[model samples]
Target: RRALRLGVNGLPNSLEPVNAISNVGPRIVNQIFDTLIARDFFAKGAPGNAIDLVPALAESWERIDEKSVRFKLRQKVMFHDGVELTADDVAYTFSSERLWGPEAIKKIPLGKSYSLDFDEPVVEDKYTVTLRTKTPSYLIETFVASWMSRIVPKEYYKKLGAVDFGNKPVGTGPYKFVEFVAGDRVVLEANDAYWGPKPTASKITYQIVAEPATRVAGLISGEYDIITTLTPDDIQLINSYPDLETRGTLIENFHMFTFNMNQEVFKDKKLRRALALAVNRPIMVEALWKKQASIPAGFNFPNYGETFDPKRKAMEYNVEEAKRLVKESGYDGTPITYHTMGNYYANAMPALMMMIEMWKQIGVNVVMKTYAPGSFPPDNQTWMRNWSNGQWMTDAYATIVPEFGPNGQVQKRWGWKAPAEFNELCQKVTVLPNGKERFDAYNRMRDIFEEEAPAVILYQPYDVYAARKDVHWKPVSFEMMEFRNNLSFG
Candidate 1:
């Protein structure tokens, strides 16, 4: 069998399945690892693929009631080590490995809210398993589809321990881990005993080449079959090449500069609005993104979603207006600093430069500070706390729940106290099953952010990937590309 020689820009920091934080590791792991439940395309309103639920490890599931769900595991599903998958395996994976094991549930960001107070998942029989939650969670299915809920073999984890498992992994997916050299490459061999349709390729490889020019050159030279992390210039060059094709899909996140509202500089709505208006988004999009991006009016939802208002205009660039707002806020040319990290995204440096220049143009003395990516989370906390006392802000395109809810990390950063009305609205929107109602609720949230101007909203670009025509696969916006569902090769 021919090997599909896919090439990524960089290798993952680690292969530890549970603790892998970066995007590259997860992208590769998704192919070799299996999840209990997968997202239905229709549920996320994605294009190309019909929205429907497909069986993975679990053949089918049903809500027993508001608090519990029962799942039926497929028979004969086996782990990479050749152990048969059973309800006991699922129970032990979740209850023992994740909830109680060294990989404590609370350490996981998304798991902080869910009060998992159930008796350990019991294997009542071989094929059936049940998971009980603290409340009637309409989003349980969504959680199950996430990385946190992926099932692992209990014995393997026990043998390797959590720390060692981070470097080595074993899963029931279609591929098996071969080797990983830090900052170099990851190699995997196709699982011949895979329970599902076997991958057409015998081996898959992920290599690290961080530079945009180098990645594009590799693709053009036939040194690599596929490449990701295309910059605006790269997209333009690739478009001119006949053998290459560019594709993009909208994912479930946003990109924005998070304002520490606790600070005097951000507390003033006019100043926030002024800062937003000062950005020449259209120019940046054209120059930096090569006109391959779309500008969104609001922060929370995607452009195609019902919450997006086609008629509503994003803030326009006006130097005079910005100066006026800055003056009105009573700032006297105080130097402000914005924190950013390298290796976070493509064209990150250029984007920060544009923002710094824009702020300087408005008569504000601004400074840009670069830090190692690992140092960002802690430094962000320090800045958020002293934002009112200091002169800096940070940017992150965080998920809504992590930024706004009662105990959200981003909300706590600025010492934000959710207003009663806003709190109530968030509550109602989350529980309401109606799509329109949920969208309307999100719109209200966007309006609140817009009015407050906590952060400068920027353009959200489609997730882009470049591939060779010989590879038979369709990209999924939400779920990472894996061998099981949306990917296959002839």
Candidate 2:
């Protein structure tokens, strides 16, 4: 059997799902974890065609009440540790302090969109469990389908401490962990006894070659089968090789220029609008993304069905109007400090440079501050945005909830805080039954976001992943990067 050598951008720093928020490591964790449901992730939403959820660990799910959901575990599901998956395992995963830490609800950055504000999952039998939301959450199934609710063996996890569990994780995933050489690579072998679709790649090696140029070189030289985070220039480079081709998809992540309301300059809405208007977004898109990206219509991606208003212009680009607004704001030019780690997203640096220069024409002091990757200025941080509605997190209300709801933890670190009305609307959005009701609530919340200007609506861009033709995988969602069923002849 062929081994799939994936040249990832960064190493998996923390193997545990809770503290693991880095770009690449969590993907490995996802393979090991068996979640309740799976999102279709099929996008560019057609009228009756939003992505639906498919079963994963749970064979079936039904909403028994307005605030609770019942799920029947797939019988005989086995963990990588050769342990059986049960209702208890699912229960422990959703609420255990041992797994997620104190206040289980607030932790886990990746699962925040899918985690429910709920009590522990209630076990009915060895194979069935009922998950209840603390509030009337309409989208509990969505949470169940996400990484947050990825089932783990209750007793096995409790026996191990956090550090040990992270180092040596056990889950009902399709791959079993073999070794992790710190700062370099993670080795995994296909689970021969995997209950679901068996992967044909007998062994998968996630080699962390941090440099883009080095990764490209490795792919072409037969050292690697897949290399991620391909830039436009990188894609151009990929085409020269006959066996090499790049994969680009509409990943549901966006980078926006967020402002701090507590900051003196950003406290004024007019100034925020002026700064946004000064940004000729198309120029930056053309300069950096070229043919790869487009401007965001509102706070989120246009694929967000009703959440996106095609005609709703929150902050359209116009240099002359920006100049007028800046002059009209009774302006005192303070250095508008823009901060990023320069490695958060592919477009951050180029877009940052182009944006700051554009705003300078409107006579604003746009000061650029940067730190190395994984180390940005504390209690601060993008857009080509410094925070609101971020990471092309595909859910309409899901994206809005964490940025504004109790689910958000009222985060201020590289995050923004919204008004009470926004939070109220956010909770209301979920409380309503799913479908048109949830959609209306979300659009109203979007309307409120536009009115407040919590973030400068910038372009939503797609991420590019380049690989050789032999690796049999395409993105289900940029978030759910799974290769459990993959077979490799590379």
Which candidate's lDDT is highest? 2
Candidate 2 lDDT over 98-195, as tens digits, reads 33335443434445333556666789999999988777876676666654556667787778855577788888888888888776788888888888
lDDT tens readout by residue for model 1, 334-444:
766666555346566687688778888887766666655345554333321111100000111124443466556546656555556666766665455546666667667
- What local distance difference test score does each model get? 0.63, 0.68
C-alpha positional error of residue 74 in candidate 2 after TM-score superposition, expressed in Å: 1.2
Query: Using Cα atoms with residue i matched to residue i, what is each candidate's TM-score against the true structure?
Result: 0.80, 0.86
Please list the Cα RMSD from the true structure of every candidate, rounded to 1 decimal place: 5.7, 3.8
Candidate 1 displacement at residue 483 in angstroms: 4.0
lDDT of 1 at 8: 72
